[PDB]
DNA sequence: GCTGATGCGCCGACGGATCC
DNA sequence: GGATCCGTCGGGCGCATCAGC
C-alpha cells in the first residue's frame, strides 16, 4: 500500500507554537544528491537545522552550493563509506564528533543537545552484526552521559526497523540487516536506557506503510516496499514540545527520504 | 583531465519443498 | 493441490581505485 504523510502539526499538545524545524536525510552520496536537486528540496523545507548522513564526501570536496545556504551557515562536517553533516541557522554552543568522527555529530544548543548518527549497517550476511551490537552498546552509554545534562534529540539513520510496522516485509527480513532481533533489541534498549521516545510512533502508533528507505532495486519505492530506518528520538522532557515528526516520502535524490521534526521550544 | 571497468557496500523476487 | 515458508540469488546506485590514453 502507498503512504500519504499526514499534514504538518505545528502546535504542541500544551498549546505552544513550533519554533524549531529539524530535517534529517541520509543523502546516499552528497555529491550525487546535489546533482539530483536535493538542496532545492531543503530550501523549500526551510529547516533551522539540517542533519545529513551517508555523505560519502570529504569537506574539501563539498560542492560550493552548500556554502551558499544563508539560513544554514553554521556547518559541521565529518568524513565513500560514511560521513555525516550538521547545518544550522544558529551557531550551537558546543560541537563534538564521535561517541568517545565519521558517524556522529553532537551539537549542544541552549535548551537541547542534538546528536546526528549514521549507525553502522549489520551488513549483507550479517558479517558486521557483532560490531553493530558493540557499537549499539557504546552509543547507548554515550547518550546516557549526555541526557543527564540537558534534553536530547537524536536523529538520522539508525539502520534498524524497530517493529514489523517499520517495514513492508517483516517475515522475510528477520535474518537481514535492519530487522535482526539483535538490532531491534538495541533500539528498545536505547529507548528505555537514555531514556528516549520514537517521535513518529508516539504520534502515530498504528500507522503502517510509513517508510524512509527503499532499495533502488526491483522498483521498491514506486511500490512502497520499504523500511523506516530514519528517526527522531526525543528525551521525555521534550515530548511536551513535540508538534510533529514527518516523513517526506516525495523528496528524491537518495534511496532514503527526508524526515522532519517540529519542536515548540 | 576524463571515461569506463571493477570492487565494495548496501533484499525483493522467485523457486521449490511441504503440509493442512 | 494450493498456501506458505525458507533458502537462494541478480541487481540499482554511488564512490574509490585503476588503467588507458
Residue numbers in the entry: 43 to 121, 127 to 147, 154 to 318
The study reports:
AP sites are then processed by apurinic/apyrimidinic endonuclease 1 (APE1), which cleaves the phosphodiester DNA backbone at the 5′ end of the AP site using its endonuclease activity. Upon binding an AP site, APE1 flips the AP site out of the DNA double helix and into an extrahelical position within the compact APE1 active site. In the human APE1 substrate complex, N174 is within hydrogen bonding distance of N212 and the AP site bridging oxygen (O5) and deoxyribose sugar oxygen (O4). To assess the role of N174 during APE1 catalysis, we rationally designed four mutations of N174: N174A, N174D, N174Q, and N174K.
The APE1N174A mutant had a kobs of 0.039 ± 0.003 s−1, corresponding to a 22,000-fold reduction in kobs compared to APE1WT. To test this, we crystallized the APE1N174A mutant protein bound to a 21-mer dsDNA oligo containing a centrally located THF AP site analog. This substrate complex diffracted to 2.29 Å resolution in the P1 space group. Overlay of the APE1WT and APE1N174A substrate complexes revealed similar active sites, with no notable differences in the position of key active site residues (RMSD = 0.299 of 2199 atoms). In contrast, shifts to the DNA within the active site are observed, with the AP site, phosphate backbone, and surrounding DNA adopting a different position in the APE1N174A mutant compared to APE1WT. Specifically, the AP site phosphate group is shifted 1.1 Å out of the APE1 active site in the APE1N174A mutant compared to APE1WT. This shift increases the distance between the phosphate of the AP site and the nucleophilic water, ultimately resulting in misalignment of the phosphate backbone for attack by the nucleophilic water. Based on these results, we conclude that the N174A mutation compromises hydrogen bonding between residue 174 and O4 and O5 of the AP site. Therefore, in APE1WT, the hydrogen bonds between N174 and the AP site are necessary to position the phosphate backbone of the AP site within the APE1 active site to support nucleophilic attack during catalysis.
